[PDB]
Amino acid sequence: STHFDVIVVGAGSMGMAAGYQLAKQGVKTLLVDAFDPPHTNGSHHGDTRIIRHAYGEGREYVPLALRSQELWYELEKETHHKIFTKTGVLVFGPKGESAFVAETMEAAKEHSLTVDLLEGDEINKRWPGITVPENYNAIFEPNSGVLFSENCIRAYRELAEARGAKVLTHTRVEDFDISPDSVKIETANGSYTADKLIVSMGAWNSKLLSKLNLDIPLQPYRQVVGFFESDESKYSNDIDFPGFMVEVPNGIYYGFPSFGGCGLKLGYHTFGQKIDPDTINREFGVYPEDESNLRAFLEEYMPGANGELKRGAVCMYTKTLDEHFIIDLHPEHSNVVIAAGFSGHGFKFSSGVGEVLSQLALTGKTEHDISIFSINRPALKESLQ
Ligand SMILES: *Cc1cc2c(cc1C)nc1c(=O)[nH]c(=O)nc-1n2C[C@H](O)[C@H](O)[C@H](O)COP(=O)(O)OP(=O)(O)OC[C@H]1O[C@@H](n2cnc3c(N)ncnc32)[C@H](O)[C@@H]1O
Numbered sequence: 001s002t003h004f005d006v007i008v009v010g011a012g013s014m015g016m017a018a019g020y021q022l023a024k025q026g027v028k029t030l031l032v033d034a035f036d037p038p039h040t041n042g043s044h045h046g047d048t049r050i051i052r053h054a055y056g057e058g059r060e061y062v063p064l065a066l067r068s069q070e071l072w073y074e075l076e077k078e079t080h081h082k083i084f085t086k087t088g089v090l091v092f093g094p095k096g097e098s099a100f101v102a103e104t105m106e107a108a109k110e111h112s113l114t115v116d117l118l119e120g121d122e123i124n125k126r127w128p129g130i131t132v133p134e135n136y137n138a139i140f141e142p143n144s145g146v147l148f149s150e151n152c153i154r155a156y157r158e159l160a161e162a163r164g165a166k167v168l169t170h171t172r173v174e175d176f177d178i179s180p181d182s183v184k185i186e187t188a189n190g191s192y193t194a195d196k197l198i199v200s201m202g203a204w205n206s207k208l209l210s211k212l213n214l215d216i217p218l219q220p221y222r223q224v225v226g227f228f229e230s231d232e233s234k235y236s237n238d239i240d241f242p243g244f245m246v247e248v249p250n251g252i253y254y255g256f257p258s259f260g261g262c263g264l265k266l267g268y269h270t271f272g273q274k275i276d277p278d279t280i281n282r283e284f285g286v287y288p289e290d291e292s293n294l295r296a297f298l299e300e301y302m303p304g305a306n307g308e309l310k311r312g313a314v315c316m317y318t319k320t321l322d323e324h325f326i327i328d329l330h331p332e333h334s335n336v337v338i339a340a341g342f343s344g345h346g347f348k349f350s351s352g353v354g355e356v357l358s359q360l361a362l363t364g365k366t367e368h369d370i371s372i373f374s375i376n377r378p379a380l381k382e383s384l385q
């Protein structure tokens with residue numbers, strides 16, 4: 001309808017955070033989303049999200065995780081919406097047989113993070129609702145916890161809008177026109193121009209980045225979570241049951257304690273169906289794996305939470321080949337910033353990424369080390385049409 005300093009396409013986890021950072025600096029910003037964030041068609045719903053600090057996936061991750069934590073605490077003080085609860089996060093697995101646990105312990109050591117190390121019966125004794133074999137070891141992070149993701153996006157949106165940011169909802173971006181001095185987006189509701197463009201369309205990045213002459217392999221996955229009736233005297237946040245992410249023989253699982261009797265929430269991380277974001281079946285239970293994969297874990301490790309399925313949710317992961325993020329400037333256009341391939345573990349960093357995206361869009365650089373997320377890295381297999 002007119003000109004803006006910056007346009008953000010995809011106002012979800014990353015986009016809304018970037019929008020808040022931009023608006024706070026007085027930048028005329030327009031955020032465009034295919035739906036009305038927060039919504040249940042992308043990758044940010046399901047009430048809760050785990051944030052961990054002892055990130056062994058990469059050292060560059062820890063600093064970003066710590067900065068994000070501080071930013072989440074800042075957001076908590078600015079809005080009336082609930083943002084974070086310090087449940088702590090438990091990580092366990094078979095001794096000497098889990099690379100996830102090992103790297104977590106290494107990360108904790110290298111960055112001097114505060115953690116408790118326990119093994120075997122010690123785990124079961126500290127948290128009654130958990131039953132693990134004696135050959136299992138664990139690392140507990142008391143200072144990390146759970147974020148209320150929908151509240152996070154809602155808060156960033158309200159704060160951004162109060163400062164002048166415009167949010168155009170139910171508007172799908174269909175094409176881009178990039179020039180060395182400006183950008184333009186085309187939608188069924190009209191075309192818009194700006195000096196800078198931030199692209200953060202989540203799972204849809206796999207289908208539309210080609211419009212920006214980018215040929216990066218991105219694979220969307222259907223990932224479900226289930227809420228189970230549980231023994232509240234053992235799995236409630238009120239009795240200090242922690243959030244968790246563990247590695248067992250058949251893969252990685254993550255879960256949350258019951259909040260206000262909502263029940264324990266569990267998800268299987270290593271498996272999901274390869275899908276197209278436009279034809280994905282968003283109904284939980286249509287595949288036998290949806291529920292069976294979850295109960296298999298519960299009856300073995302948390303029997304007291306293997307109750308009636310209270311509710312399920314379908315959501316998406318967007319993976320890169322190396323499972324590391326993509327946060328960088330378009331290789332050919334310095335006025336286009338790309339945020340994609342969060343591979344199922346990016347929400348906890350959304351506050352920090354919002355800061356990174358705003359810095360890149362306004363100055364072409366950022367104070368954070370984002371070298372591991374380069375769009376030019378080999379393992380990615382990036383090319384142009
Ligand atoms: C799915 C999932 C993910 C997940 C998780 C549990 C489940 C079931 N648990 C996590 C956890 O405990 N800790 C953590 O750190 N991450 C966890 N995740 C992953 C995290 O949720 C995702 O990495 C994150 O949400 C990715 O954010 P991103 O911003 O990429 O994705 P989005 O929030 O879906 O936003 C994309 C938005 O863009 C819009 N869109 C799409 N296409 C268009 C077009 N054409 N035009 C305009 N807007 C568009 C969408 O509407 C969406 O809002």
Ligand SMILES: [Cl-]
Pocket residue numbers: 043316317318319341342343344345346
């Ligand atoms: Cl993702």
